[PDB]
């Protein structure tokens, strides 16, 4: 891991990296953190097959209290590549069982609300996006942003306002969010 | 006003209007941020004089003169004001707005206490009138307050 995430600074480790994962899987290919990390090396690769070949291997196994955590991690990234592409029913069945499985999980909710939001039901997507903003306290702002425009496009102008006043007193470097939304709200107000 | 010959409106274009009883254009006053809450100060022996207090959206609650000139108040606010109520005789000023609390300050603008929290904005609040008989004594400590929140509830 520390090899593919520390970049160009050697550019062999993360071949070297690859050999060691592939030696291991050949004594051991049941272990679940080797195939997540020869998944994340062929996703760093350019490989598109054999990702998600990968993927789909580590899927069929069964869930083993052990080894829950690393699961969870594999099927978050199998739900992205399903919502890389236009196969949204897939992503929703991978986003309800890690839903089903875990509770406090952040980009799940995220990426579920720009599902909904993207199929235009506002209220689920506002919900989600409301309890995924809830998770990481008061700290982003990119999913603030989108839990005030659904807010706006739902005709719940004093919610909006009071994340466009929450946002703006946070990070006074978002011009965006000020001509967009909050003037809106303001005049449609009375 | 309470000497009923002045009248004052604000505009959300920022624009604040004092005009007389012929509705004539007495003064202007050209700002950059919505006007939602204007009141006349009541009439005093002590003051005899009226000034109007009007709350800005920039978190602002300014004092401005009959010709128009400001008097540099300009006091600042933690939150966007929404009303703004004079007490009689002129000695409290009951304010509400964004963080869903109501409060009290002297007309000078000391915080005194906050009166309720009630989990959204509140609309509109006022205070109970009272009347003083000719050389009336009592302590008159009863403060009596309404409120009206977004949910849709009616409090005092």
């Given at each position: 891991?520390?090899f593919?995430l ?5 550019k ?10 592939n030696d291991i ?17 062929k996703?760093?690769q350019k490989?598109?097959?054999?990702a ?14 052990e ?8 099927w978050?990234?199998?739900?992205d ?6 196969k ?6 991978i ?18 609300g720009?599902?909904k ?8 997507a ?7 903003y ?6 982003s ?14 005709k ?10 929450k946002?703006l007193v ?5 011009p965006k969010?000020?001509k ?11 | ?10 505009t959300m ?14 003064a202007?006053?050209?700002r950059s941020?919505p006007?939602?809450?204007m ?6 022996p ?6 109007l ?11 401005y ?7 540099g ?5 933690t939150?966007?004001?929404?009303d703004?109520n ?9 304010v ?9 300050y ?9 009166v309720?929290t009630?989990?959204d ?10 009347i ?14 309404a409120?009206t929140?977004?949910?849709?509830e009616?409090?005092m």
């Amino acid at each position: 891991y520390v090899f593919f995430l520390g970049g160009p600074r050697y550019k062999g480790g993360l071949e070297q990296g690859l050999k060691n994962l592939n030696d291991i899987l050949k004594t051991n290919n049941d272990y679940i953190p080797a195939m997540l990390a020869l998944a994340v090396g062929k996703f760093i690769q350019k490989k598109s097959t054999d990702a998600k070949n990968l993927l789909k291997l580590l899927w069929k196994r069964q869930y083993t209290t052990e080894y829950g955590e690393d699961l969870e991690r594999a099927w978050l990234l199998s739900a992205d590549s399903f919502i890389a592409i236009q196969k949204y029913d897939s992503a929703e069945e991978i986003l309800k069982k890690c839903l089903k499985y875990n509770q406090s999980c952040g980009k799940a909710e995220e990426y579920m609300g720009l599902i909904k939001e993207k199929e235009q039901s506002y209220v689920d997507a506002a919900t989600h996006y409301e309890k995924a903003y809830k998770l990481t306290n008061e700290k982003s702002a990119s999913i603030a942003f989108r839990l005030s425009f659904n807010y706006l496009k739902a005709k719940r102008y004093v919610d909006c306002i009071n994340i466009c006043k929450k946002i703006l007193v946070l990070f006074p470097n978002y011009p965006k969010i000020e001509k967009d939304c909050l003037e809106k709200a303001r005049q449609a107000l009375k | 006003s309470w000497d009923g010959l002045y009248l004052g409106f604000g505009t959300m274009g920022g624009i604040i209007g004092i005009r007389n009883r012929a509705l004539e254009q007495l003064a202007e006053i050209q700002r950059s941020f919505p006007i939602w809450c204007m009141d006349w100060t009541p009439i005093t022996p002590d003051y005899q004089n009226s000034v109007l207090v009007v709350g800005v959206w920039e978190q602002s609650i300014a004092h401005y003169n009959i010709q128009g000139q400001q008097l540099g108040s300009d006091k600042k606010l933690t939150y966007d004001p929404i009303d703004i109520n004079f007490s009689t005789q002129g000695e409290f000023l009951l304010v509400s707005g964004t963080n869903n609390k109501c409060t009290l300050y002297t007309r000078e603008g000391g915080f005194l206490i906050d009166v309720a929290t009630k989990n959204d904005w509140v609309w509109n609040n006022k205070l109970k009138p009272v009347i003083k008989e000719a050389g009336s004594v009592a302590v008159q400590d009863q403060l009596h307050v309404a409120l009206t929140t977004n949910d849709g509830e009616i409090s005092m």
